[PDB]
Amino acid sequence: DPTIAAGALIGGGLIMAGGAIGAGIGDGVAGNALISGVARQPEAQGRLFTPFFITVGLVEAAYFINLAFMALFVFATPV
Amino acid sequence: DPTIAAGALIGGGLIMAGGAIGAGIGDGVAGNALISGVARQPEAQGRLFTPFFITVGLVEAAYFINLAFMALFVFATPV
Amino acid sequence: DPTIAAGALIGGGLIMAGGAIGAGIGDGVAGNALISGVARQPEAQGRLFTPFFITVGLVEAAYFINLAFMALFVFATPVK
Amino acid sequence: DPTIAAGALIGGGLIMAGGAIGAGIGDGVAGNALISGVARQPEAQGRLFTPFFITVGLVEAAYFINLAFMALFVFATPV
Amino acid sequence: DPTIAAGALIGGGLIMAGGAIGAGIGDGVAGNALISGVARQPEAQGRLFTPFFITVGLVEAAYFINLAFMALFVFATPV
């Protein structure tokens, strides 16, 4: 068995590694356009949160789906 | 058999690592254009959500197609 | 066989990890130009879909050529 | 048993590797918009910290959630 | 023999992984300039295909050289 437990920890660690790369860069890249948009015009700050939180919602969906599959590999290992 | 089970969890972990990297950055980069367009002119979002959800539908496939093959590797291992 | 089979599952996993990274970022970078364009000129949409789907076709091709070899590794393992 | 402990250290290491990649690039990409906004108009600094720290909060959450799961893998190994 | 075979599969997997990352991002970044040129002025649409396919030719040369070396590792293994 140990082998399968080591494979689960490495496989789960890959899933959360790729999750944080997708999330941290995705939110930085989306938030760069929020900061530049508010800088471009402050009165648009209220409207710009809609395009931003749609984008952040899509980026975080990849993160929390990866969090669920890491938790499944770790706590409910499929073999 | 436990060597194949570890190879499946590491292989499936790679598939879901690259999936979340690809889509999380791709959605940040696609939403950066939406938020910048809606900063340039507010009504843009109105005709933006078609180019945006076409782009998000092309980007998210990379991750989803990967989640289908990760599930095959991990739950129903081909070898 | 198990060490070759694990090598095929890790090798196939790498092929599809690189595939989805190339696809998801390639389409995000290509679609950023589509969403910007129409944002600037709202009519150009109909003309921009040709440059867009030319680009997306090339980015999808790099992904689906990778997906094919993952199958060649996993279901038809050549050195197995 | 030490095969699991090795998998916990390689795994936990992956989680923090993907954390610093997501955080460092995400904050550099968000801060590039802050430095560019302030440079163009000095008086914008006071308003641009809200979009900036909203962005950094989302980018850092993906770091600290990865750090928390690394600590779980390494100090309290889940399998 | 099986240890060399597993090394050949992981080696060939890496070659095509770096191939698709280089190709997919290279073609997306090249095509972003094609789409931006047709977004700026349509009267350019005929001429841009020379710079575009010079770029895609260089990017896909790195992809197909990697595909050739994957095929060499997997079907004609040097050990």
Next chain:
Amino acid sequence: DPTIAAGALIGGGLIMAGGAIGAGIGDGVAGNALISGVARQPEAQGRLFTPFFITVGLVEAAYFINLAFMALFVFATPV
């Protein structure tokens, strides 16, 4: 115990690998805005160093937290 020692060195290697990718690219991207900001208006140098060293502070926090955990994996190995 040598299996844990190899796992510690590989895990510590991943932690500092991701650390320098996050740091070097995050600071290159933040410093690009500083160089272009001082290219746009020279007298801004002083003003820019606050947005810049906030950004570099956040990027290097994600680096030195990784250095602290690499040191814990390698010199004070959890198992």
Next chain:
Amino acid sequence: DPTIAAGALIGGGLIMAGGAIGAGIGDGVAGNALISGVARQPEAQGRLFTPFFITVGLVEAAYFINLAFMALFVFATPV
């Protein structure tokens, strides 16, 4: 030797993976400027090939130096 032949093929795989990533993105990023120059000024084509091929020469040099070391690892394994 087997273990060495597997290490040579995984190491050679890494060398050509990093080679094609650097090549494909370096060429795509360089070609984005060539395409944008010919979009902006069709009269510039004749002058822009000197800046582009110089850039592409530097991008390709790291790829072909990697190809030479992959061949050395795999055909002429040093240990």
Next chain:
Amino acid sequence: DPTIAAGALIGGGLIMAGGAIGAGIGDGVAGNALISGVARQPEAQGRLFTPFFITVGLVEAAYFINLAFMALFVFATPV
């Protein structure tokens, strides 16, 4: 001994792999702003080397700290 000696070389290799990715991309992204400032107005050159070498100092500090730890992981293996 050989399991730890192998883990030291794989680890040290990761530290330097991430080091050169951080350094080479960080320096290219920083120098892209320097070249662009000298293209915009050349009388800025003498000032722009100050923000450039501030940026390069930070990008290279991450690389030379990684190079120091690579040596410790190998020539002086801590475990």
Next chain:
Amino acid sequence: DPTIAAGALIGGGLIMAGGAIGAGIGDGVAGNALISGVARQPEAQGRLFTPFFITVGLVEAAYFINLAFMALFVFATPV
């Protein structure tokens, strides 16, 4: 001994993989600014080669320092 020699080849392979990624992207991102400057105004070409070959010198230094350490992990294995 062969466990160490395989670990040396995997490491040396990592060192040149991260090298070529940082080199090819660093050179592409630097050359994108040179090509853009010579597009914007042809008379800049003579002055821009100093900022360009400074930037390329720094990017390539990280590549050749990595190549020096790969040779070590390939011909003069330290442990």
Next chain:
Amino acid sequence: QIEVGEHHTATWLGMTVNTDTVLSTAIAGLIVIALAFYLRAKVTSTDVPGGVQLFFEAITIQMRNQVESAIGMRIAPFVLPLAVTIFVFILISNWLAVLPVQYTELLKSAAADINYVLALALFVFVCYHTAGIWRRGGHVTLLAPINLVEEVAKPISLSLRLFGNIFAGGILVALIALFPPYIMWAPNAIWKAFDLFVGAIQAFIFALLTILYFSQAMEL
């Protein structure tokens, strides 16, 4: 614990078929034609439209203007009814699964199995495929094999995007049931909310990419 790709099955002409899921695509098929019955029931032309009439209209004028640019509406008016029927049938086939029947469930999105999905992939393909030869009986030959890859990749993409996306939700609604019940309702509600949105956007993408592939088949 969890097992992906498990359905009731039977055989009707020597060939095997699923006994499960088929009911789910039948409820969807009944609901789309039943809604239409209501449309004809309270369809207005000189008065105030009913909720079903304004809903579909909004879809119909969306799909009509999208096809307008893809290809002359007259050149191929047959794409419009195909686009709206694809949209509404995929939309309800995704939403119907917002009815949890865990006991194992009873109401599972047909998009869960690739069969319900290779269809919208191969039917759409044979559709524009013939339109292309009906219409006419790329930029660089040096790359022309990549077109053959691209045209083989279009039905694969359509199929695997719709499959893998709704199939992810089909796994996640089982995965969350391993979480204690006194808390699991919160992530369950959050996932169901996201799966309504993604279930609609997936139908929108499949309808739009259908029109755009008809356009690429029928241009010149």
